[PDB]
A paper describes a structure:
Here we report the isolation of five neutralizing mAbs from an Indian convalescent donor, out of which two (THSC20.HVTR04 and THSC20.HVTR26) showed potent neutralization of SARS-CoV-2 VOCs at picomolar concentrations, including the Delta variant (B.1.617.2). One of these (THSC20.HVTR26) also retained activity against the Omicron variant. These two mAbs target non-overlapping epitopes on the receptor-binding domain (RBD) of the spike protein and prevent virus attachment to its host receptor, human angiotensin converting enzyme-2 (hACE2). To further examine the structural basis for the difference in epitope specificities of THSC20.HVTR04 and THSC20.HVTR26, high resolution atomic details for THSC20.HVTR04 and THSC20.HVTR26 bound to wild type SARS-CoV-2 RBD were determined by x-ray crystallography, at 2.95 Å and 1.80 Å respectively. These data confirmed non-overlapping epitopes separated by approximately 4 Å on the same protomer, with both antibodies directly occluding the ACE2 binding site.
The THSC20.HVTR26 paratope was predominantly made up of residues from CDR-H2, -H3, and -L3, comprising 80% of the interface (top and S7B). SARS-CoV-2 RBD positions G485, F486, and N487 buried all available surface area into THSC20.HVTR26, forming almost half of the epitope. Key interactions were also made with E484 and T478. These sites are mutated in the Beta and Delta variants respectively, both of which were neutralized by THSC20.HVTR26, suggesting that the combination of these mutations likely contributes to reduced neutralization of the Omicron variant by THSC20.HVTR26, although quaternary interactions may play an additional role. THSC20.HVTR26 had an epitope most closely related to Tixagevimab (Evusheld), and shared elements of its epitope with Bamlanivimab and Regdanvimab, all of which display limited neutralization of, or binding to, the Omicron VOC. Meanwhile, the neutralization activity of THSC20.HVTR26 was unaffected by any of these point substitutions. However, THSC20.HVTR26 binds to SARS-CoV-2 RBD in a manner that makes it distinct to other clinically important mAbs.
Numbering used by the authors:
A (entry chain L): 1 to 9, 11 to 27, 27A, 27B, 27C, 28 to 95, 95A, 96 to 106, ...
B (entry chain H): 1 to 82, 82A, 82B, 82C, 83 to 100, 100A, 100B, 100C, ...
C (entry chain R): 333 to 527
Write the structure that this text describes.
């Protein structure tokens, strides 16, 4: 539906400034001084950062500033901090008591220390194997930047059948998490020697292995 | 102590109806402009509806003619009645206070922004039937990672606690995967002192309200 | 010889909303104001420009009686020099007022369980009333910079609000019936005299 247009993503380095644009039309952004901006952490409600183009609610850092020119509003963030790596939305009055949001922008703050992923790999529980199903569970946490590739292996052979892998998701600590499930038949799980989950992050690869129980 | 708490979200068939509620505390919906704003999973915010003085109501064209916003002042509650629901209405629905010129935190000017927000309530419009999850223990093999797998449920969400809430440190419940089957799976894992393995009982309490599934699953070290 | 029909004013069965305050002219009659002033039925009886005890000795051209309902904590606004929602937007006495303001608690008649909402006041106006001005318009009030297009909405308000008189309200929020007597002196023979 009609929305204000924001870049899908912007990146900035710490200590530097970054601007996010928000382009509407002469009948919303271009007609009123009623642009507001919001910050949204994953799983949380948006927080109001700016309203009436440039005003800050009490308690909001003066690192955040708003402006507008013609049909385009801009949010500028200075003294960029790791905490800023969140989504941002603009919003404008659209006339006759209606409101319209922009599509949102994901801000990335560069230069942060790379953090390798912690991996935990679980084999199928005995209960599930009793239910005639098998599921290997590979959990990935505490990685930054928030991007990983996951490849499964069965005795060193590539596995792409049965892989379901989540997108990365930002954690409270400003790192990311993801998970990958491999669905196997009980027979396939126990026919192979072992099985492995390999997570690739910023070139490096971290692997974990499991195998059917001894008895 | 201002707060908004939405409820009423759940699974509905296309063409069905559902009423959301939004309970305010610390201020009165009767004396404020209010709005509903929704957010499809992984997508952006969309203004749905607003209510102003005299219960004057306004709607986005995407919902106009199908949704109705209202207030009940004695219960200090805002509602959204949704009819003729479509799959495209699937979203987290938030209620929010819309600041205006007469709002007490405005010194001058017009307001025009959403400053108080609820936590949101999830609405899923689908023809698929609700399916409660199958909970399996993820056994431990000094720190120790144990957990449990909540497999093949629909729709979102699922809540996971440990020892009925007593155990919160080291807990990490992972965002759910949406499988090709259209069913969700998630895992929750807690890191605990290894020395507690086999003496401290660890139970994951899994709740999937859409299907009314409450499961307490004990995670035990592996015993052959 | 005929007595002024003050009963029709003070014992009226209906009272106006304050924004639509009612005026009754009184002329060609004898006014016993001391019986009014000594009446225990009035919570408020304040005169300006005249002594209440001396009113029975005076002759005026005409007397005007303005009557309406407000809430108790607003009675103080029915006086010269005052401000607030009622004095500013509903009923305004001049600085040089010559008359009396009379009020009494009407909780027993004008409140009801669940709220009596029949009485209204003007909450918004672009400017203050002049003395004795009366505004019964109902244009949408533009509280912000954006247009209303004749309907309520964002920063756009219906200008009247209802009092919600409930029996259990505190006195400041209970209904009071108010009668304002104005004493008029023109270049004509007096027609309203004391006994
Ligand atoms: C306003 O009315 C009161 C009450 O009048 C009586 O009760 C009414 C409900 C109605 O039935 C009237 O016809 C009744 O006469 C007046 O109070 C009376 O005043 C007269 C004259 O002073 C006195 O003889 C009565 O005892 C009073 N009654 C009571 C109950 O006290 C009052 O005078 C009227 N006010 C004005 C300005 O005329």
């Amino acid at each position: 539906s009609y929305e204000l247009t924001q870049p899908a993503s912007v990146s900035g380095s710490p200590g530097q400034s970054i601007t996010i644009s928000c382009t509407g039309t002469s009948s919303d952004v271009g007609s009123y001084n009623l642009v507001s901006w919001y910050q949204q952490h994953p799983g949380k409600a948006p927080k109001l950062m700016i309203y009436e183009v440039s005003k800050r609610p009490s308690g909001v850092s003066n690192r955040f500033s708003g402006s507008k020119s013609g049909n385009t509003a801009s949010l500028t963030i200075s003294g960029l901090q790791a905490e800023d790596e969140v989504d941002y939305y603009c919003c404008s009055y659209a006339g006759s008591s209606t409101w319209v949001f922009g599509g949102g922008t994901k801000l990335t703050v560069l230069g942060q220390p790379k953090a390798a992923p912690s991996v935990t790999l679980f084999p199928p529980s005995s209960e599930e194997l009793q239910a005639n199903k098998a599921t290997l569970v590979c959990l990935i946490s505490d990685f930054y930047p928030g991007a990983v590739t996951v490849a499964w292996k069965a005795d060193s052979s590539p596995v792409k059948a049965g892989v379901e892998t989540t997108t990365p998701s930002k954690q409270s600590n400003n790192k990311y998490a993801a998970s990958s499930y491999l669905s196997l038949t009980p027979e396939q799980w126990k026919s192979h020697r072992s099985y492995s989950c390999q997570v690739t992050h910023e070139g490096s690869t971290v692997e974990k292995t499991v195998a059917p129980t001894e008895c | 102590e201002v707060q908004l708490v939405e409820s009423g979200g759940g699974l509905v068939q296309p063409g069905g109806s559902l009423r959301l509620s939004c309970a305010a505390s610390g201020f009165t919906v009767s004396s404020n402009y209010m709005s509903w704003v929704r957010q499809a999973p992984g997508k952006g915010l969309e203004w749905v509806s607003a209510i102003y003085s005299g219960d004057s109501t306004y709607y986005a064209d995407s919902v106009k003619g199908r949704f109705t916003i209202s207030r009940h002042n004695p219960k200090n509650t805002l509602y959204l009645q949704m009819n003729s629901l479509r799959a495209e209405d699937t979203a987290v629905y938030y209620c929010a206070r819309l600041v205006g010129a007469l709002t007490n935190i405005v010194v001058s000017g017009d307001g025009g922004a959403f400053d108080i927000w609820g936590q949101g309530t999830m609405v899923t419009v689908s023809s698929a039937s609700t399916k409660g999850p199958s909970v399996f223990p993820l056994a431990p093999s000094g720190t120790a990672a144990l957990g449990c797998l909540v497999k093949d449920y629909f729709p979102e969400p699922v809540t996971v606690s440990w020892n009925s809430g007593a155990l919160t440190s080291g807990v990490h419940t992972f965002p759910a995967v949406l499988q090709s089957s259209g069913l969700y799976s998630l895992s929750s894992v807690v890191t605990v002192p290894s020395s507690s393995l086999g003496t401290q009982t660890y139970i994951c309490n899994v709740n999937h309200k859409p299907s009314n599934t409450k499961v307490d699953k004990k995670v035990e070290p592996k015993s052959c | 010889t005929n007595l002024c029909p003050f009963g029709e004013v003070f014992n009226a069965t209906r009272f106006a909303s304050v924004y639509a305050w009612n005026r009754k002219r009184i002329s060609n009659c004898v006014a016993d104001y001391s019986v009014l002033y000594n009446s225990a039925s009035f919570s408020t009886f304040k005169c300006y420009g005249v002594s209440p005890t001396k009113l029975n000795d005076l002759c005026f051209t005409n007397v005007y009686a303005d009557s309406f309902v407000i809430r108790g904590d607003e009675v103080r606004q029915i006086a010269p020099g005052q401000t607030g929602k009622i004095a500013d937007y509903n009923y305004k006495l001049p600085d040089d007022f010559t008359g009396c303001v009379i009020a009494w608690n009407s909780n027993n008649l004008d409140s009801k369980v669940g709220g009596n909402y029949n009485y209204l006041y003007r909450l918004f106006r672009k400017s203050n009333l002049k003395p004795f001005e009366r505004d019964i318009s109902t244009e949408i009030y533009q509280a912000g910079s954006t247009p209303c297009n004749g309907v309520e909405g964002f920063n756009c308000y219906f200008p009247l609000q209802s009092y919600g008189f409930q029996p259990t309200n505190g006195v400041g929020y209970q209904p009071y019936r108010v009668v304002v007597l104005s004493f008029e002196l023109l270049h004509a023979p007096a027609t309203v005299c004391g006994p």
